[PDB]
Design a protein around this nucleic acid. Sequence first.
DNA 1: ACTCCG
DNA 2: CCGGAAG
Lengths: 321, 317
Amino acid sequence: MGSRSRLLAANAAAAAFYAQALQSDEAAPARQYLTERSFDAAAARKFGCGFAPSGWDSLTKHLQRKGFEFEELEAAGLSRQGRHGPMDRFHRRLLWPIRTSAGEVVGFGARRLFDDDAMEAKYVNTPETLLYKKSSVMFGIDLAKRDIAKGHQAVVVEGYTDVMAMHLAGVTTAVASCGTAFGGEHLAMLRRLMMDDSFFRGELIYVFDGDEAGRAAALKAFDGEQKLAGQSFVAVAPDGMDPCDLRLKCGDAALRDLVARRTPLFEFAIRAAIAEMDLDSAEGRVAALRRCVPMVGQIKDPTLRDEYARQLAGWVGWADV
Amino acid sequence: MGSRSRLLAANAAAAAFYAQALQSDEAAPARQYLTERSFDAAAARKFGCGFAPSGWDSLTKHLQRKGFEFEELEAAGLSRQGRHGPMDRFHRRLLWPIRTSAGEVVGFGARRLFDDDAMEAKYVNTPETLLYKKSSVMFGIDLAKRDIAKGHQAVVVEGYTDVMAMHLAGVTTAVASCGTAFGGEHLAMLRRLMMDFFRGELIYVFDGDEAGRAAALKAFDGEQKLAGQSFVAVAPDGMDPCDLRLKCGDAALRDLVARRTPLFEFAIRAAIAEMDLDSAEGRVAALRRCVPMVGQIKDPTLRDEYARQLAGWVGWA
DNA sequence: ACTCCG
DNA sequence: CCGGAAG
């Protein structure tokens, strides 16, 4: 009673219930959200997509009949303390079940679909429980687990629909931060899977939406450098778009090649600084070096710093590229 | 009395005596030898180079005066009992001290300088003492210990003079298996240093000759998952790292190490080099001989990488 | 493997 | 009245 093995059965029973409810009459805008961005019902079923019904306690009552006591459901982040009996957490929202590496269901990410929705946020997730650890949790991990270790690659993307779009386009290494910013436990988790024989060898690709978001991620490459900055990479979609919207406009090939034709994390940052530079005659040419040999100076890896110093003169214009 | 700290004291005092002896009259061939390949006195002082004097027992007496019993000096591998009294191990030679990673002298490596030298062998070493362990001992480790950990790169030259050259040229990760060839306990030490950050390269540097390919047929056989992180640089023909610095310069050695071939790539393209490859009949025979090699690669992702490139290496098939 | 020159 | 290498 009220232990991991029980609570994972509740979330599994809930996943089934929410996946059942996706096919109802009132779940029309939920299915339309998916098909609007090229996600058919077979894709929705692969990622466990679901709908949260509109009533007070449509889930709580369903699980209470299946045998689950309320205190277990409260602990699993499905039901909650109400006035006239217990009530549900999620209402009138498109759901994505969030699984572990093992494929055990730990929580849900719920998207808004209605203007009269009482909940403010565009996305809301399961609260902190014994099962659901926001800071370590990642969407897509159950599917990607084997492909990231085999391939020695991981593609980090922003949202839920970005992970679906990547997986359907062949990029099965794709995962998402899921509720908050990408962080240390997420890296630690991903890094552990790519390890072989007590050595890390793979590559760590970060996809971004718009340009400044990625420039505002490359900046922080130099912040600590304890991470695998040498094995980190950046991919930015053509001016404006993100992986989901890129798939609609230009098809599954554009995603495969966005990942393929990427840039190293330090390179992207350095060249971003040269991009915003005058570079005509010697005036702005020296102003480039002035500003971004400090950037090279900050690189702690001497093998890697020597490589960027070699190429620095060429990129600004004073040497042959 | 014959303890570990006693034998360290004896060896350090011996390295001091031998270093003083290098500035003497009879040590002129040793001073020339070093300076003849661009190692000045400042370099010689950095690595602690020294001359073993000519007589029967100049060191042995010198240490006995300082306090050291003969029994300790025999355990330290410095002296040995002759019939008319104690006598030195080394005579009339250029010595390099060999140290622990901390910087403590455990033994000595000694080169022949004269045609009338007692010992005809090219290099003498200290025997298996309580400190000196041939299988784990490495010249240049004291100087590189830090830099291989920071840089995540270890460079394995052959000779004593190659370690010297590399370090003066800026390759401060260079190291050398003195006495014996490079081995298991050396790898296990260098692998350890580079862990404490995850990854780590490991570059081997041979002369421009068949020595590299023979030590290399041994690239496939064992599981050896450090073979992904192994690399092989090789200079212009005939030249060790010491000779390369004489001809070309300090920049040539840096770039030799920086322009390195991976161990599997080196092994494949070595077999490609000894093949017809001009006619279309020649390309097929090459492709036939060196897919078994790509098949011997146990790692599947690494195997497929080398298969892709194989079409290119064999003159576009 | 027991019996010439630094 | 040597120690290494000769064999």
